[PDB]
Amino acid sequence: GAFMFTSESVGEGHPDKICDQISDAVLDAHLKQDPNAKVACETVCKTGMVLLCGEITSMAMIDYQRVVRDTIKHIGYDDSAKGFDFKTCNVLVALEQQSPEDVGAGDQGLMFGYATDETEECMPLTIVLAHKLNTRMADLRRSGVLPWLRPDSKTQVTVQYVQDNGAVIPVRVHTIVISVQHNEDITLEAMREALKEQVIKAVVPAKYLDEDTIYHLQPSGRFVIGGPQGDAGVTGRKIIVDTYGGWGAHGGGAFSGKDYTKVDRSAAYAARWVAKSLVKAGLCRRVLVQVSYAIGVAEPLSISIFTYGTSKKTERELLEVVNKNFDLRPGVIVRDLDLKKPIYQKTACYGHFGRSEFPWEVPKKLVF
Amino acid sequence: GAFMFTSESVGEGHPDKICDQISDAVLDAHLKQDPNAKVACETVCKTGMVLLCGEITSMAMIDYQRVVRDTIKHIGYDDSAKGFDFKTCNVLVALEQQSPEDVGAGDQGLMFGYATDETEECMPLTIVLAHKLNTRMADLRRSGVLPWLRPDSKTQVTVQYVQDNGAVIPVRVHTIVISVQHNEDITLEAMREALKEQVIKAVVPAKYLDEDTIYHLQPSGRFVIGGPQGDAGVTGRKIIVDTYGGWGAHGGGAFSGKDYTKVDRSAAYAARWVAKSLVKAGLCRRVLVQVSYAIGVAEPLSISIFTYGTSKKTERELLEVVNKNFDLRPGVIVRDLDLKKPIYQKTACYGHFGRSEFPWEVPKKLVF
Amino acid sequence: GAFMFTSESVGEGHPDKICDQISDAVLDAHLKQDPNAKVACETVCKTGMVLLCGEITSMAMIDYQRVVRDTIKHIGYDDSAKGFDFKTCNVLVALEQQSPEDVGAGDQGLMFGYATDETEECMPLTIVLAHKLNTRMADLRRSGVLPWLRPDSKTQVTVQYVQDNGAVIPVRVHTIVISVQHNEDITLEAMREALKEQVIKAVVPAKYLDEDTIYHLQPSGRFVIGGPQGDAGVTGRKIIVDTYGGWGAHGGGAFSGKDYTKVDRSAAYAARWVAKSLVKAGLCRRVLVQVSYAIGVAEPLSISIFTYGTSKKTERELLEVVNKNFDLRPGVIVRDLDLKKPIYQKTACYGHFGRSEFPWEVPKKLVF
Amino acid sequence: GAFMFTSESVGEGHPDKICDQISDAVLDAHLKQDPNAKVACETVCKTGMVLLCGEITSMAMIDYQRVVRDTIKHIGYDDSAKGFDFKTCNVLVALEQQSPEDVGAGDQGLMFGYATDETEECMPLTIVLAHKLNTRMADLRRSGVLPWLRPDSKTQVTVQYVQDNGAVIPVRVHTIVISVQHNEDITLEAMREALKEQVIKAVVPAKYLDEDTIYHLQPSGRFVIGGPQGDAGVTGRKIIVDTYGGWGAHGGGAFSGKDYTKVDRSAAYAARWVAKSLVKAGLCRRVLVQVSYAIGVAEPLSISIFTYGTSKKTERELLEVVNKNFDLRPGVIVRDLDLKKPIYQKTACYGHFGRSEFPWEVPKKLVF
Ligand SMILES: Nc1ncnc2c1ncn2[C@@H]1O[C@H](COP(=O)(O)OP(=O)(O)OP(=O)(O)O)[C@@H](O)[C@H]1O
Ligand SMILES: Nc1ncnc2c1ncn2[C@@H]1O[C@H](COP(=O)(O)OP(=O)(O)OP(=O)(O)O)[C@@H](O)[C@H]1O
Ligand SMILES: N[C@@H](C[C@H]1CO1)C(=O)O
Ligand SMILES: N[C@@H](C[C@H]1CO1)C(=O)O
Ligand SMILES: [K+]
Ligand SMILES: [K+]
Ligand SMILES: [K+]
Ligand SMILES: [K+]
Ligand SMILES: [Mg+2]
Ligand SMILES: [Mg+2]
Ligand SMILES: [Mg+2]
Ligand SMILES: [Mg+2]
Ligand SMILES: [Mg+2]
Ligand SMILES: [Mg+2]
């Protein structure tokens, strides 16, 4: 039942993602010394000018200059011409820091969860490829293989699909668009060549690459001193690339900068968890689990499972499976998913869903 | 086939929405003197400190201090204690301004469109009520009826639904959560009363209000000097409340601050247009139109119509209807929808979709 | 030998003085936990926006938000309309903090010292009155006597003089100009009355007030919401009001924000010390002691005493007196003057010289 | 009657001086299109971040981005590593601009004027050499002779003197300290050599250079990426280097950023004028002219001439000479000195007094 789809992703150097990372870096920095630290911060950046804002109630001694500059360094901003230098950039900290199982969900909410068997990650091929494309470039950057590669990048992958008396089977990569920052001493011809052979063909399965697949490598020509500038970088502004690439559903809640007590993060992770578990357990080929919460109440206020006719069990057979295998109460979620652990920075880029190294990406058994 | 859903909205005083409005105000200010002005700006705010960033190629004389302060005034920030005063706030302008039909879509893209017949607006009841709730409060604020009401507010509406051999029929409002900024001389008891009788019951259809409907009015107690700080307001960070409240699909593209040449705005409007037209024309009760574009190409690179079995015509009968009634090329969109007109500021709050006063909300005839 | 002179002073609310105080507050905050803390910081302010910049090598845990906001509170900025509120203002900290007798003067330098017997403080009448005028207003502000009085103020005192076979004897106050911030509910007539009876006549000696003395109280009319705004407040920009009101000599070195290791502060204090000691010891009625230092060298590179023919001993009789009573080496200065003590904030306003509560203002014995 | 003296100066790259220049550049930019423009602005900078603040009532169309960036370019900040790049730095403009002979002096004031015959400029040798030292380095920088030389520099000159039955005769340069920013590819040994032969010996008269003269060239080692940070540059913070190097007297009034209607600038210039005229006319070898003004009154409220026994005429013979040759009323000053002309930027560095190219530096005839 043909149709096409497109998704995008950005590198660690993208202004918005730098802020997402810095904000989560500050979250990690607090969890390490106080796993109960209450973090609620965000970052704003603009050409060698980083603004750390926020309200965090914690009892840990943190050097914000250090955690911000280290994060910028990690990203690869050490030289001047790159558009950022951790040693010279302005780090204005306007942060306010205080000191002092059946909890109960804060703020009326509605979290979504999604999973599909089109890839081993249980995530849409389009967004998976988009992320992996950026990931590979960072590897080649950090390894030395492609030393002209700079932190800021953007990726878009559009794949042609076809339904299947259930749902969504990828056929081929229609077109790929990739833009990456770079050093001056490297020709546009050499860049485009390296992008096709060393990054694209090294990550995209042969089955999907074609003789007609369209490539748009460095479309706008050069992107040298571009760096994290844009016109400004912000936290929580890359909401779709952090999730499913526009495939599931999204209520609008941002992740980065918020601790594990905010249902926007925790419950979203939990919802992904059950979704991935369901498909992995063969109970369906594609699911859209919807978990609702009521302010004050701990136990979820109605969970809905949305298969697209890919399950044999039947919604409200699968719900009992979820109700017998999962305890989606906020407090239990953080305990079961080990959400007090400082893993948030690595979650701040290349997508929150898909990578198996995260607790919520490990499928639960599911006793049926 | 019961399930529940929640959506939210924010008032004109919400930090993020102030930036969305200011950014669009600057867009309007340019269109009035140069309908071909190229606008690409964004705003950042934090307690009496507004930062205007951006790159705009136009040929019009604009007083940015005036357009920013006027917008803050319009929102209702004229006094000190409110958290913002257009006469005293810092307006730092770091804006860069230059001077000098079958066009062709910029940037690979994928826009979504959505519509449902559950309301006359052809928008989800949950998000419609959420918006209207905030709208009413602004009215009472500006009229004088509720003089304690302040600009910043947040609304959440969760409605219980039930499918219908097609899709989505609202049954009742399960719970409503509303938080609004206020003056000191007004009791929490009087506020909660006014919110239930004068705002909620004055906008929510009797059919949906119940004896069990849950109300959470000013849950967190007092919200006085809670003016625009919210740890830094930003443009393009309220992506879901500007669209369908998490009901359709969203690629992640922000509207505010971008002119009519960016497919992220124009094409999204166009997609909404056809969706609303389809249901209005009786061709379906609920649609998710998906329009894809290819960088360089003008004509859309595959449009997909997604009814949920609510149409009698059948997808790929409805596609021809769309192909015979619509010309979704970028240039034609702006011409047909009159996108060079300065209406963008009023679009910057209370949702981009739903209100009939916008071109894209006027259903096209549809000759079938 | 008639001539006239004018001097000025500013209140604790003056933008520049707020920065001088905040910078010294940060210095005090470090000395209390590490008397060897290396402080080099400065502040910038602009309408509820404070920027703390600087490089400080210390080993003490300081809450910069607390030390900045407390200082703003102390000044009297607690309400909105005053132009500053310590609870709501933006405190952006871009501060960089590290951790790890015959020393030797840093930086070639030339410090000046001055003293005259026209007042018991051994300071020019014009600047003494100017300071005391502002001091009194703060008292009435903090006591409650004049509750309409606000932090920001400016004072100017011009006195008619006459030489005396030596030097400088004040005759009468020619004119006084005083401007002070205020609350709305207070008439310009009532303000001007209170300024003349309760502040001016309560501090200026009867001998100097005349029937012709000119008063300019609130000349520019109102000064309500003025507050610390100007167009910006800065540290080290009020160099003359911090010293002698334009009577001695000044090389240009700023005090506030610099620790005791900077000769600009320490040596200037030391020079004042010896000057005050000389006149107090009857060795002269007016002196201008000039102490020069050589980078690397500890012992002063030539000290010059400048009496205006007011001494009977004779320059290079008085120099030996100074060389036999004083050891102006940097390290000895800090030890003898107890410069590791956190008294710097109170030094940041109303003048560094004159007030007896400071070590350098206590005359040394002088054995001759 | 031996004694020593030291003075300092800074290059065009010094943070404070960049702000002084930028502020005056904005003043020039307005005078060119509206000679009656009311300018009152100041600048703040910090590592690729320039903040333009101010209130200017004028009727001229100015591109502040252009005037700020052009000024940074002129200074020599075009590359990244230098600590500033006019093409990439953040120029935040928070400027507020409106549109619409016997005047009368604004604000009670007391301006000073100074002159001495020890140099042809009629300025202290110490400050003249200090300025010229920085001037020469800029020449070699802009010519190409010393291509490693960067904008930011600091100079200190200490000269040994001796009185002379009147006053002040320089004997020799005791020590010279000079620090200048530089490029990486240049040895500390080569720099120090070039500073002694090509800059110092090329500007300092043979008569003053000795075999004992002490040189401190690049004392602190390397000053590479030491671009304009210096923990925030500011306008009006280099008050003494803009005048007499601590030789005359200074009330504390700043010049840069203020138009010709502010007595702080105009009257100070006028006072210098008469001082230079007096010595040039042989009426004295050293003078300290003191001009006082009364708020509202146009004609100066008492002028005092202070020779140090270097005049044969006798104070109050010289006063009549000044009263018969000069009309120091504010309005007349601007007319006679052509103060509506945009020459203020070149006045913003290397000293306001001394250079003959300025109106106030051209000695008036003096008919006696
Ligand atoms: N001068 C301009 N004229 C027209 N459109 C512009 C202009 N400047 C920016 N834009 C638009 O807004 C978006 C770019 O902003 P930004 O400076 O944040 O860079 P980036 O972070 O490197 O890019 P991106 O976030 O899109 O991947 C683009 O999609 C573009 O359409
Ligand atoms: N719009 C303007 N037009 C002309 N001159 C101005 C203007 N705005 C400011 N000035 C000048 O510069 C100085 C005022 O600046 P500021 O805003 O720092 O206020 P303040 O700190 O409250 O005052 P002050 O420091 O002089 O005691 C005045 O001496 C005045 O001459
Ligand atoms: N930085 C932009 C394009 C570069 C060429 O200006 C981008 O990431 O797409
Ligand atoms: N704030 C200014 C004057 C007030 C009236 O605008 C001052 O301190 O002189
Ligand atoms: K945006
Ligand atoms: K968002
Ligand atoms: K100034
Ligand atoms: K100064
Ligand atoms: Mg990009
Ligand atoms: Mg592009
Ligand atoms: Mg993007
Ligand atoms: Mg004042
Ligand atoms: Mg005045
Ligand atoms: Mg002043």
GROMACS .gro file of C-alpha atoms in nm, chain B residues 19-177:
model
  159
  387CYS     CA    1   0.877   3.492   2.167
  388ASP     CA    2   0.659   3.328   1.903
  389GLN     CA    3   0.448   3.643   1.889
  390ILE     CA    4   0.738   3.888   1.893
  391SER     CA    5   0.906   3.693   1.613
  392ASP     CA    6   0.589   3.698   1.406
  393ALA     CA    7   0.532   4.064   1.491
  394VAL     CA    8   0.867   4.140   1.330
  395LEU     CA    9   0.753   3.933   1.032
  396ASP     CA   10   0.431   4.133   1.004
  397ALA     CA   11   0.620   4.460   1.040
  398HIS     CA   12   0.823   4.371   0.733
  399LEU     CA   13   0.544   4.233   0.514
  400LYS     CA   14   0.351   4.559   0.547
  401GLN     CA   15   0.628   4.753   0.372
  402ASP     CA   16   0.782   4.473   0.164
  403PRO     CA   17   0.565   4.162   0.093
  404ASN     CA   18   0.875   3.994  -0.041
  405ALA     CA   19   1.078   4.053   0.273
  406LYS     CA   20   1.283   3.749   0.368
  407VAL     CA   21   1.232   3.689   0.738
  408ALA     CA   22   1.416   3.440   0.952
  409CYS     CA   23   1.423   3.557   1.313
  410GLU     CA   24   1.366   3.421   1.663
  411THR     CA   25   1.328   3.563   2.013
  412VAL     CA   26   1.455   3.474   2.361
  413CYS     CA   27   1.323   3.627   2.683
  414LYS     CA   28   1.400   3.614   3.053
  415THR     CA   29   1.252   3.851   3.314
  416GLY     CA   30   1.246   4.194   3.151
  417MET     CA   31   1.510   4.094   2.898
  418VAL     CA   32   1.420   4.026   2.536
  419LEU     CA   33   1.675   3.919   2.276
  420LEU     CA   34   1.589   3.955   1.910
  421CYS     CA   35   1.810   3.739   1.689
  422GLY     CA   36   1.787   3.670   1.319
  423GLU     CA   37   1.878   3.723   0.956
  424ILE     CA   38   1.625   3.920   0.754
  425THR     CA   39   1.672   4.038   0.399
  426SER     CA   40   1.419   4.315   0.348
  427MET     CA   41   1.373   4.669   0.223
  428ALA     CA   42   1.155   4.830   0.489
  429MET     CA   43   1.229   5.069   0.775
  430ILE     CA   44   1.135   4.905   1.104
  431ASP     CA   45   1.174   5.020   1.464
  432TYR     CA   46   1.247   4.688   1.637
  433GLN     CA   47   1.225   4.851   1.979
  434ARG     CA   48   0.875   4.960   1.886
  435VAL     CA   49   0.761   4.626   1.742
  436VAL     CA   50   0.893   4.432   2.042
  437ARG     CA   51   0.761   4.666   2.310
  438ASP     CA   52   0.424   4.704   2.138
  439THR     CA   53   0.388   4.327   2.130
  440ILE     CA   54   0.469   4.300   2.500
  441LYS     CA   55   0.215   4.575   2.567
  442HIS     CA   56  -0.052   4.395   2.362
  443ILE     CA   57   0.006   4.083   2.567
  444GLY     CA   58  -0.072   4.281   2.882
  445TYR     CA   59   0.270   4.346   3.030
  446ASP     CA   60   0.253   4.711   3.133
  447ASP     CA   61   0.309   4.693   3.508
  448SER     CA   62   0.618   4.593   3.706
  449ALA     CA   63   0.491   4.310   3.933
  450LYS     CA   64   0.352   4.118   3.633
  451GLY     CA   65   0.701   3.996   3.542
  452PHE     CA   66   0.736   4.226   3.241
  453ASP     CA   67   0.686   4.592   3.154
  454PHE     CA   68   0.723   4.701   2.792
  455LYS     CA   69   0.840   5.044   2.910
  456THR     CA   70   1.123   4.912   3.126
  457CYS     CA   71   1.232   4.573   2.988
  458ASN     CA   72   1.566   4.526   2.812
  459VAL     CA   73   1.524   4.478   2.439
  460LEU     CA   74   1.860   4.364   2.303
  461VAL     CA   75   1.844   4.355   1.923
  462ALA     CA   76   2.115   4.142   1.760
  463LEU     CA   77   1.920   4.132   1.431
  464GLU     CA   78   2.112   4.145   1.096
  465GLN     CA   79   1.920   4.320   0.815
  466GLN     CA   80   2.031   4.337   0.449
  467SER     CA   81   1.850   4.522   0.170
  468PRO     CA   82   1.820   4.345  -0.174
  469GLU     CA   83   0.451   3.015  -0.938
  470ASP     CA   84   0.681   2.726  -1.024
  471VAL     CA   85   0.959   2.826  -0.781
  472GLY     CA   86   1.075   2.501  -0.626
  473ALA     CA   87   1.055   2.370  -0.270
  474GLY     CA   88   1.343   2.454  -0.039
  475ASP     CA   89   1.483   2.168   0.174
  476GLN     CA   90   1.364   1.808   0.144
  477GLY     CA   91   1.046   1.803   0.351
  478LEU     CA   92   0.741   1.614   0.469
  479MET     CA   93   0.440   1.812   0.590
  480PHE     CA   94   0.134   1.670   0.763
  481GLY     CA   95  -0.230   1.778   0.759
  482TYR     CA   96  -0.512   1.673   0.988
  483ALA     CA   97  -0.885   1.715   1.029
  484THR     CA   98  -1.174   1.546   1.207
  485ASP     CA   99  -1.549   1.619   1.216
  486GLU     CA  100  -1.583   1.603   1.597
  487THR     CA  101  -1.608   1.983   1.607
  488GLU     CA  102  -1.714   2.252   1.358
  489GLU     CA  103  -1.352   2.372   1.340
  490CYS     CA  104  -1.247   2.028   1.211
  491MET     CA  105  -0.996   2.002   1.495
  492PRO     CA  106  -0.967   1.767   1.797
  493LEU     CA  107  -1.208   1.865   2.075
  494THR     CA  108  -0.931   1.834   2.331
  495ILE     CA  109  -0.708   2.097   2.170
  496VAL     CA  110  -0.998   2.320   2.064
  497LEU     CA  111  -1.127   2.343   2.420
  498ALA     CA  112  -0.773   2.393   2.547
  499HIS     CA  113  -0.728   2.691   2.316
  500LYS     CA  114  -1.073   2.839   2.372
  501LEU     CA  115  -1.020   2.814   2.747
  502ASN     CA  116  -0.714   3.040   2.722
  503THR     CA  117  -0.890   3.266   2.470
  504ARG     CA  118  -1.181   3.331   2.706
  505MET     CA  119  -0.948   3.426   2.991
  506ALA     CA  120  -0.783   3.688   2.772
  507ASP     CA  121  -1.126   3.825   2.686
  508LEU     CA  122  -1.228   3.858   3.050
  509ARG     CA  123  -0.886   4.008   3.115
  510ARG     CA  124  -0.918   4.269   2.840
  511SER     CA  125  -1.287   4.339   2.900
  512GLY     CA  126  -1.249   4.400   3.271
  513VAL     CA  127  -1.478   4.120   3.388
  514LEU     CA  128  -1.189   3.942   3.563
  515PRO     CA  129  -0.934   4.223   3.633
  516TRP     CA  130  -0.715   3.997   3.847
  517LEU     CA  131  -0.634   3.780   3.548
  518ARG     CA  132  -0.276   3.815   3.415
  519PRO     CA  133  -0.123   3.722   3.071
  520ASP     CA  134   0.053   3.394   3.155
  521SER     CA  135  -0.162   3.081   3.163
  522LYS     CA  136  -0.159   2.709   3.084
  523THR     CA  137  -0.449   2.482   2.995
  524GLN     CA  138  -0.498   2.106   2.972
  525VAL     CA  139  -0.811   1.927   2.860
  526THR     CA  140  -0.856   1.551   2.871
  527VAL     CA  141  -1.161   1.405   2.699
  528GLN     CA  142  -1.289   1.048   2.698
  529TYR     CA  143  -1.355   0.914   2.355
  530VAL     CA  144  -1.499   0.617   2.162
  531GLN     CA  145  -1.439   0.507   1.803
  532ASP     CA  146  -1.717   0.457   1.548
  533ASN     CA  147  -1.673   0.228   1.246
  534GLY     CA  148  -1.448   0.497   1.117
  535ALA     CA  149  -1.319   0.720   1.392
  536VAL     CA  150  -1.314   0.943   1.692
  537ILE     CA  151  -1.621   1.064   1.872
  538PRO     CA  152  -1.581   1.265   2.198
  539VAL     CA  153  -1.801   1.158   2.489
  540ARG     CA  154  -1.724   1.385   2.784
  541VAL     CA  155  -1.459   1.604   2.945
  542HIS     CA  156  -1.288   1.378   3.199
  543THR     CA  157  -1.076   1.647   3.364
  544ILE     CA  158  -0.965   2.007   3.309
  545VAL     CA  159  -0.649   2.167   3.445
   0.00000   0.00000   0.00000
